[PDB]
Write a protein that binds this DNA or RNA. Sequence first.
RNA 1: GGCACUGCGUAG
RNA 2: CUACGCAGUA
Lengths: 115, 62, 814
Amino acid sequence: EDKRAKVTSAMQTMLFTMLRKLDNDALNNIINNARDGCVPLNIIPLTTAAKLMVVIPDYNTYKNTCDGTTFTYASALWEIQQVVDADSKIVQLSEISMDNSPNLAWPLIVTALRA
Amino acid sequence: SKMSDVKCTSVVLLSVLQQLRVESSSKLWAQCVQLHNDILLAKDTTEAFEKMVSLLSVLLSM
Amino acid sequence: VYRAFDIYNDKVAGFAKFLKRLTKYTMADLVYALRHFDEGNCDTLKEILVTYNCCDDDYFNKKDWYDFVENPDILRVYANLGERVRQALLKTVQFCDAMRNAGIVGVLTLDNQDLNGNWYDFGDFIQTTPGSGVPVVDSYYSLLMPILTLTRALTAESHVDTDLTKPYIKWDLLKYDFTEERLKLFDRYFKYWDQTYHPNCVNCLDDRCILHCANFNVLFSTVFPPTSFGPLVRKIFVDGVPFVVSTGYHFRELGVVHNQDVNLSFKELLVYAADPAMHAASGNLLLDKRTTCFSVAALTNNVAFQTVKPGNFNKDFYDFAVSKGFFKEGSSVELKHFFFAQDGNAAISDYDYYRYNLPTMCDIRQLLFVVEVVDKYFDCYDGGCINANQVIVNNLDKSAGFPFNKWGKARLYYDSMSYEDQDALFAYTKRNVIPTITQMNLKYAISAKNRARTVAGVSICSTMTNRQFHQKLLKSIAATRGATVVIGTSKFYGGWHNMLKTVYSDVENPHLMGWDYPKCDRAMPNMLRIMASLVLARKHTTCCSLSHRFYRLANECAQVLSEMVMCGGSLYVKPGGTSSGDATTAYANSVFNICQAVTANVNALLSTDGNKIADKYVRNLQHRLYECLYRNRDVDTDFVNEFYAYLRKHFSMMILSDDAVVCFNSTYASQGLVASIKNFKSVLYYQNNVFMSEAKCWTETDLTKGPHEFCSQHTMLVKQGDDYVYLPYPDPSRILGAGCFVDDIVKTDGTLMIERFVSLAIDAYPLTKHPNQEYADVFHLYLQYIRKLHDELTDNTSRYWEPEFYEAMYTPHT
RNA sequence: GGCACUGCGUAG
RNA sequence: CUACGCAGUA
Ligand SMILES: [Zn+2]
Ligand SMILES: [Zn+2]
């Protein structure tokens, strides 16, 4: 019984923790946009998420996708706020170059915020 | 046969490398893993010695 | 010259080759080339590809050009035919309409339409009242179907005005109900397919209707955007606070499935937590360029990379083996099984192998007859729904899946869930769909190849409900002896000999045959998994209604076929395949294997010339097979029984979920009345979308040698009690590698070591009977080493190193 | 830190 | 027959 009560409390707490992370500003708008009120799950982050993470395996993909400090994805304009390598060490935008590519620990995780 | 004990020494070398917290670095761990897998899958004794010497040099760097 | 014809008359019936503006080739030649595929004879396919600018001549000079796995670029080459095929479809419909306007009752065959799409034949046509003549297009469409998704004929439907040059259609991002578009797609292409088509499989009559409608939907789901498929969420209010909860699902094959208990309770807490809606809604967007797989969200602020450690080494055992003369230069017994280490990018690289799974549209009439025949292999077992108190769980100290692994193991959940709560959840799953999230974890085990292997731990809700649904049938299958499926049959105590004698049961000219499935867990089509689930669910005619069985199938599809993969800390969508951590992986795999074998047999018997068959009974069987396959709607139980008996007599199978040993009549296979390696290769090419190579398949002429390899064991005939019995032995390299390399250092010294080697000495005893001396010395090495461990650690235990303890393990006494 | 099956091992 | 640990197979 004690394990049951503790686990009930923990799962309720974790659901509430996800709830506090959820922003209704865009979710309400997209929900009211739909006539039925049901929307696919896979389009919730594509329209309501404020932070985007991109994993880059090679420099060619980096140049193709997010070469500059500001790029576009999912019909939205994103601005780069952080870049790190596979060791979770901060890598500057100037550090990423064709000459410096062998010195970088790929893949590169770039974190951007919606604009 | 030197192939077998070369493979065994390569296995223990990668184990002690992992115990030395080398897997924190992505590039060094990737190189060590590729060298160890190539040693294990190799069929040429001289190539196995060459790759094992490369791995041992990587270990001796730190 | 030799041309492919689909013939059906009073004498011969089948889709076979015969000696007999207008283009050189016809549509039947393309269908035959892509269905009966042999790399040795690929001419007709080569001129078909070259003539219509699908590729160049130099393309075929490349080795492994046909292989899907080795040369995925071929998927582009075939796609160049697709639009052409699409045009043919349109013309076909026009032709049908013309006949309907002329009062013509006729049968449309593939061999009368050239590759330009024109119909140049008008035979076998009888006048009727104008405006009433009905075409027969069952065989045409049924044979054409696999080529529709092999060549991706409907891709042109993804563009505005269905024009390749024009840009894509910008579908509404919020749109999820594509039913009207499915009606339009069925109306333009399959207009005269007279069987009723329900886009949402909720509205299906029975299992066969579900299979037919899902077969159509698999083709029709390629046009629609991939963001629309998945759980459908709704914003509800509980206790005065909003939640995002899934109130339905959108299967590519089953259409839109809405829940019935949508209300806006530890069971309800599990239903909420297992739902990916709450995890993906609050997660950050993800763009993972490492894979072409669609990504959903990143549940953490940092991506995690998991590495596989190198296996430990046993210097004691290796030194002992070297001191006894093992691992010597030029020895027949060497080390080839090692612990292979992997870097941090191994997990996502393994997950990227799901790109081999493709949308395959199976031949519907063939699949229906094949499922009817496969159901005969499972008529001896019994199955049904069981209560929560009758469910037996082997071990409760395993992972409970995501996100339930953050709080405890499965034991805690089974303890908290009262029997009434478990029954309530099980009854809930019969009315609603519960999407789940399954983790993929790198596995740490011996291998002879450096490719990493992953295991898909599933959530506790799916495990519980699937157990309550399927455990009776699973335990019935595992407890039956002398059947086709040999799951649960122990190889010890004469089990191997009994299994082999069962396989050799009264075959006129017996030869042994065996094959393997390349990328079986990654390349299995969704239709075959759906059919396997339906076969396993056919035992519930008396306990579950139609709606309950359909919703259980939808739950299995959502929690297995279209899972949410929690890979490396991020949510991806699984295109298909099977979960290695599923409840019914082995049994669904066995059903799929029997399906492939029966399909190969049907293809071999139908592709036979027929006129050259010297047996009246076999010719009549072939004619009845064709007329019950592409001309009979309802199930013909008499002919299903007859064909099942024919296969059981001339094609004896021993199946364990991937390993198949077939004892087949050599003469019948030689004449083409029974499947061979070529037939299985063709079937795998046009159904499983994988090229099967002759290196992974074996054939044995002398039964005394036995199967070359079954369950990674070789078979030999040995003397015991004046009796020649079949005895299985493993690879000595595998046993030596297991001895030398242990999983962790805890198993490098101590009492446990003894037990380990004892088990190994149990598995590698038969090598003493092997003619090769090193194999026989392996077991004596293990015995002497166990004796040395006894000496180091230190009368009951004295039995551990005497050979009689392992002698008794292979006698039929127990 | 996955499912199913078989076989051993120490305790009743 | 139950609990636990190990080994093999897919
Ligand atoms: Zn239907
Ligand atoms: Zn039932």
